[PDB]
RNA sequence: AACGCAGCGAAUUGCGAUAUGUAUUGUGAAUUGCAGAUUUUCGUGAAUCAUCAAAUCUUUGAACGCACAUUGCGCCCUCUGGUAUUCCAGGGGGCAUGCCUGUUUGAGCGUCAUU
RNA sequence: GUUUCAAAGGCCUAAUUUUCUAGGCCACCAUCGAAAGGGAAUCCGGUUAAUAUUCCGGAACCUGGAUAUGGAUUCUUCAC
RNA sequence: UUGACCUCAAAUCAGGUAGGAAUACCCGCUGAACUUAAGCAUAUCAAUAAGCGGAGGAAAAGAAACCAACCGGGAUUGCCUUAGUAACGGCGAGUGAAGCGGCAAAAGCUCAAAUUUGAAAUCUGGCGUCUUCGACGUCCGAGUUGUAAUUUGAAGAAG
């Protein structure tokens, strides 16, 4: 909202980096049952704070 | 301050109310001229300073090793008696000759009954100003009571 | 006897001899080394395609700077490491949460010549 | 034997000498604060019979507490229940005013440990008590074997749990046929005899 | 790369030069990291920075102990940690310190041995 | 509790600008999805190993200089810069509250002796 | 409850020219509360795929530090 | 004019100490109603849930101001019995112990109140030195309005 605080901007900085798809080289690991990232966020669908 | 207003009003509150005869007798204190002669006497027969006790114990250790003599060595001390529980026992057995009681003990209950005890046994006693001044002759801050028993001829 | 004369009707706290510290043992034992060093403040040189355009034209080199870094400290850090006299400093915090410091040098030192020395261009 | 004279003199409370001293002392304690530090014991005979010793470690504290009953704190006397529990004004507190006095000084002086309390004086609005304390961290109390036991970790807040002289009276812990429902423990005894004990072979 | 046992014998000034030289290598490799896909050389050099800082901190803390040895009262970090409850509780000198009346009681009538 | 750290990780698992760890001890050659070394491979030594007694430990929190929808605003000692006991910045060390034991300055015709 | 039936302090000049000591005056009192109230001082032209009263060019202004040149003032003086 | 004493203060004085967490069990305070009585008000659920304070590996209790009426037992704690009994209760519904007896385990003790009075004999801190959970020596302070030794009712003290 333009005039925002530093404590708020620090949380939104995380939300940028965490929101990204599953890297491919992890899927070739031994045992590994993971396929796609469950914890994923879109701005229209779900909100943060 | 509040502590100054307390002690000044505590002086007044005791005076305005009718005090009983048992508390009232401590106002009858020893006068200035007679008192000075008493403490001139009692500064003789005063106890040992800490250095003079160390002087005596070195003389004790010398004579015991080479001589072997206790009970007569380092003569017999003539000294003033002090401490409340210590002094009360001497008055109870008719041993004390003179007694000096303080006028400003914190609870009066401690020292109020001593005038009645000395009456029954027929012991000379005298209330005197300054619990501090009884302390000065006995290497103490405050003494409360100070009595005599033994004295030179 | 003979009271202390006093004009005022108030009574205040008389100031007393306030004594200083003089301890028998140190609480810390070992004094800690420099928290923020010259190398720790300025971390990386930024090599985006926009930054190359500023180095040639504007006479300004750009850095990725650590958080907890004043414009006094960044001016001292660049002066010590690369041996250059700095003109001005401008700083911003990126959206990802990392500080960026635009640094403009004086007319004596060329930004392009020092750029090829450090590594990138 | 000076203390024995005070032991007998204190009992004669309605005398001329003591009713004077009682009224002079009770005024002084009102002007001072609710909880405040006392320099020496007011009753020197009474203190040493409860384990007081004049040396570095032992401490005395005066304290004032309100008289009368406890009131039920519900607003406007609205209990919300059956007629049995509608009482408000005539209900009473289960611990004594000694225990209330002993606990308040414990919260102020947390580092100290409570040993005992004794009655000084009273009026219509208040009662007065003098709680004696012991410092466990001080090295005189730690080394000397007579007063070492108090320094142990099991004696942390004796006043709160009710392990003092007044506490064990209020709990009702005495040997006798009169004391069955509370003796070992009131809730402990209830928890024992309201329980179904079953073995492997019935 | 660097061994820890080699850094024990060195003086105070030698470790200070060693540390400054390692930081310059770390700075130069971070420039290479953005002009190259992969670079596992960066891992080994920053382990060596941690090795030197560990050796310097030991020599200082040893020197503080060396002067404080003998006397009462030392820094709280250098004292015995253990735990809170044991540290406040009584020592082995204390508790065992029993009164004078039960010294004479223990000597006179101790627990004697017997059979049958 | 927040925010960070892997050659390529978003989560989980570990750790704190010495950041998937450092030193110390034991075992004796791995780790492995793909790289890359290091040759350390008859060794004072591989390892996401076991072990664990020396250290590091961001910002917080009982949370402690005063505040805290603020990365807000001060004060003291100390070394280095800009001409500097007083102004500006930088590196380091400190300043909460109640209660106890002692130390040093004190307040009160509360009260004692001496000029 | 927030100035009370509290012993509630922080502001200036020398002394001393070790930089630590002396002068003094004055006194019912924390701290948070407004990105529309109060409030020290910046404008024009240019430039980016996406930023600007914040970068570049050119012209100003305030607050806090230091300080010396010119001018003014001075035989009765702090201007006519 | 100078120095004491008693009460009360101040300091970023020297050195210490208290808070929060977890809460199965343990020690206290506080305290309901649904329900049962075929209704409902004493009663019952219950001296219980929720709420508040405080501990430890255990806690509490404990060396008789006891139980008995026998040819008398002998600190506390728990298990088997006593007993669904003696009592309580709109004597309705319902509630309800303890002594002896047999076992598991057993351990006893300390202050105050007397004068060392031919010697405050006692203790904290400071400074120094050692074999450093301490010991020895020395200097102020605490304290005679009572710190050591001596004695605790089973006794015990002075000759």
Automatic annotation (TrEMBL), chain B:
Quote one Gene Ontology molecular function term: RNA binding
Which Gene Ontology terms describe the biological processes this protein takes part in? ribosome biogenesis
Q: What residue ranges are annotated as transmembrane?
A: none
Q: Name one GO cellular component term.
A: cytosolic large ribosomal subunit
Does Ribonucleoprotein show up as a keyword for this record? yes
Domain named Ribosomal protein eL8/eL30/eS12/Gadd45 is located at 68-153
What is the role of this chain?
Answer: Component of the ribosome, a large ribonucleoprotein complex responsible for the synthesis of proteins in the cell. The small ribosomal subunit (SSU) binds messenger RNAs (mRNAs) and translates the encoded message by selecting cognate aminoacyl-transfer RNA (tRNA) molecules. The large subunit (LSU) contains the ribosomal catalytic site termed the peptidyl transferase center (PTC), which catalyzes the formation of peptide bonds, thereby polymerizing the amino acids delivered by tRNAs into a polypeptide chain.
Q: What is this protein called?
A: 60S ribosomal protein L8
Q: Which residues of the full protein are shown?
A: 52 to 204 of 255
From TrEMBL, chain D:
Cross-referenced InterPro entries = Rbsml_eL15_core_dom_sf, Ribosomal_eL15, Ribosomal_eL15_CS, Ribosomal_uL23/eL15/eS24_sf
Domain of life the protein comes from: Eukaryota
What PROSITE patterns does the annotation carry? RIBOSOMAL_L15E
Keyword terms, alphabetized: Ribonucleoprotein, Ribosomal protein
Keyword Ribosomal protein belongs to the record: yes
* GO CC annotations, alphabetized: cytosolic large ribosomal subunit
Q: Where is the signal peptide?
A: none
Gene3D superfamilies (UniProt xref): Ribosomal protein l15e
**What Gene Ontology terms for biological process does this UniProt record contain?**
cytoplasmic translation
Report whether Hydrolase shows up as a keyword of the record.
no
Q: Which Gene Ontology molecular-function terms are recorded?
A: RNA binding; structural constituent of ribosome
Q: Name one Pfam family in it.
A: Ribosomal_L15e
PANTHER family linked:
LARGE RIBOSOMAL SUBUNIT PROTEIN EL15, RIBOSOMAL PROTEIN L15
Instruction: Give the UniProt family note.
Output: Belongs to the eukaryotic ribosomal protein eL15 family.
Which protein, by its recorded name, is this?
A: Ribosomal protein L15
TrEMBL record, chain E:
Which family does the similarity line name? Belongs to the universal ribosomal protein uL29 family.
The keyword Flavoprotein appears for this protein: no
CDD domains (alphabetical):
Ribosomal_L29_HIP
Q: How does it assemble?
A: Component of the large ribosomal subunit (LSU). Mature yeast ribosomes consist of a small (40S) and a large (60S) subunit. The 40S small subunit contains 1 molecule of ribosomal RNA (18S rRNA) and 33 different proteins (encoded by 57 genes). The large 60S subunit contains 3 rRNA molecules (25S, 5.8S and 5S rRNA) and 46 different proteins (encoded by 81 genes). uL29 is associated with the polypeptide exit tunnel.
Q: Which residues form a coiled coil?
A: 5-32
Q: Which Pfam families match?
A: Ribosomal_L29 (PF00831)
GO function terms (MF aspect): mRNA binding; structural constituent of ribosome
What is the organism field in this record? Kluyveromyces lactis (strain ATCC 8585 / CBS 2359 / DSM 70799 / NBRC 1267 / NRRL Y-1140 / WM37)
Taxonomically, the superkingdom here is Eukaryota
ATP-binding keyword on record = no
This chain's protein is named KLLA0F05247p
Q: Which Gene3D superfamilies does the annotation name?
A: 1.10.287.310, 6.10.250.3450
Question: For this chain's UniProt record, which GO biological process terms are given?
Answer: cytoplasmic translation; maturation of LSU-rRNA from tricistronic rRNA transcript (SSU-rRNA, 5.8S rRNA, LSU-rRNA)
Which stretch is the leader sequence? none
Q: Which keywords has UniProt assigned to this entry?
A: Coiled coil, Ribonucleoprotein, Ribosomal protein
Task: Cite the HAMAP family for this sequence.
Answer: Ribosomal_uL29 (MF_00374)
Q: Quick one: a GO cellular component term?
A: cytosolic large ribosomal subunit
Q: Which SUPFAM superfamilies match?
A: Ribosomal protein L29 (L29p)
**What does the UniProt record say this protein does?**
Component of the ribosome, a large ribonucleoprotein complex responsible for the synthesis of proteins in the cell. The small ribosomal subunit (SSU) binds messenger RNAs (mRNAs) and translates the encoded message by selecting cognate aminoacyl-transfer RNA (tRNA) molecules. The large subunit (LSU) contains the ribosomal catalytic site termed the peptidyl transferase center (PTC), which catalyzes the formation of peptide bonds, thereby polymerizing the amino acids delivered by tRNAs into a polypeptide chain.
């Amino acid at each position: 909202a333009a005039q925002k605080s530093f404590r708020i901007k620090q949380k939104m900085a995380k939300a940028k980096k965490q929101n990204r798809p599953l890297p491919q080289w992890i899927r070739l690991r031994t045992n590994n049952t993971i396929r796609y990232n469950a914890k994923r966020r879109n701005w229209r669908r779900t909100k943060m704070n | 301050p509040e502590y100054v207003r307390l002690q000044r009003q505590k002086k007044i509150l005791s005076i305005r109310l009718k005090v009983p005869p048992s508390i009232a007798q401590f106002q009858n204190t020893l006068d200035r001229n007679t008192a000075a002669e008493t403490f001139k006497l009692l500064k003789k027969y005063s106890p040992e300073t800490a250095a003079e006790k160390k002087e005596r114990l070195t003389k004790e250790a010398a004579a015991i090793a080479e001589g072997k003599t206790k009970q007569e060595a380092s003569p017999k001390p003539y000294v003033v008696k002090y401490g409340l529980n210590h002094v009360v026992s001497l008055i109870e057995n008719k041993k004390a000759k003179l007694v000096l009681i303080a006028n400003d003990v914190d609870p009066i209950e401690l020292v109020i009954f001593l005038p009645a005890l000395c009456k029954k046994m027929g012991v000379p006693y005298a209330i005197v100003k300054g619990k501090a001044r009884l302390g000065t002759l006995v290497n103490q801050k405050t003494s409360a009571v100070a009595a005599l028993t033994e004295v030179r001829e | 006897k003979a009271l202390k004369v006093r004009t005022s009707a108030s009574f205040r706290l008389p100031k007393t001899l306030k004594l200083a510290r003089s301890p028998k043992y140190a609480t810390k034992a070992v004094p800690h080394y420099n928290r923020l060093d010259s190398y720790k403040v300025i971390e990386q040189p930024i090599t985006s395609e926009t930054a190359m355009k500023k180095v040639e034209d504007g006479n300004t080199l750009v850095f990725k700077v650590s958080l907890k870094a004043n414009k006094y400290q960044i001016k001292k850090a660049v002066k010590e490491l690369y041996e250059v006299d700095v003109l001005s400093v401008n700083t911003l915090v990126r959206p990802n949460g990392t500080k960026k410091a635009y640094v403009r040098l004086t007319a004596d030192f060329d930004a392009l010549d020092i750029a090829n020395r450090i590594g990138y261009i | 034997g000076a203390y024995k004279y005070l032991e007998e003199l204190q009992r004669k409370k309605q005398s001329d000498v003591l009713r004077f001293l009682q009224r002079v002392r009770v005024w002084e304690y009102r002007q001072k604060n609710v909880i405040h530090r006392a320099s020496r014991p007011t009753r020197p005979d009474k203190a040493r019979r409860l384990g007081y010793k004049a040396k570095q470690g032992f401490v005395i504290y005066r304290v004032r507490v309100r008289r009368g009953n406890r009131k039920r704190p519900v607003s406007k006397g609205a209990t919300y229940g059956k007629p049995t529990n509608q009482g408000v004004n005539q209900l009473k507190y289960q611990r004594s005013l000694r225990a209330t006095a002993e606990e308040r000084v414990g919260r102020r002086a947390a580092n100290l440990r409570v040993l005992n309390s004794y009655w000084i004086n009273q009026d219509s609005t208040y009662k007065y008590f003098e709680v004696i304390l012991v410092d466990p961290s001080h090295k005189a109390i730690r080394r000397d074997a007579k007063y070492n036991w108090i320094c142990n970790p099991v004696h942390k807040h004796r006043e709160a749990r009710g392990l003092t002289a007044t506490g064990k009276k209020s709990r009702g812990i005495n040997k006798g046929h009169k004391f069955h429902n509370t003796q070992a423990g009131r809730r402990k005894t209830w928890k024992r005899q309201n329980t179904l004990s079953l073995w492997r072979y019935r | 790369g660097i061994k820890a046992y080699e850094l024990r014998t060195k003086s105070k000034d030698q470790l200070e030069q060693q540390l400054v030289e390692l930081k310059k290598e770390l700075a130069e490799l971070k420039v290479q990291k953005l002009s190259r896909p992969s670079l596992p050389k960066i891992n080994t050099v920053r382990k060596n920075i941690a090795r030197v800082l560990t050796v310097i901190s030991q020599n200082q803390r040893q020197a503080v102990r060396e002067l404080y040895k003998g006397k009462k009262y030392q820094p709280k970090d250098l004292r015995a940690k253990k735990t809170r409850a044991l540290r406040r509780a009584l020592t082995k000198f204390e508790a065992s310190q029993v009164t004078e009346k039960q010294r004479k009681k223990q000597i006179a009538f101790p627990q004697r041995k017997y059979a049958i």
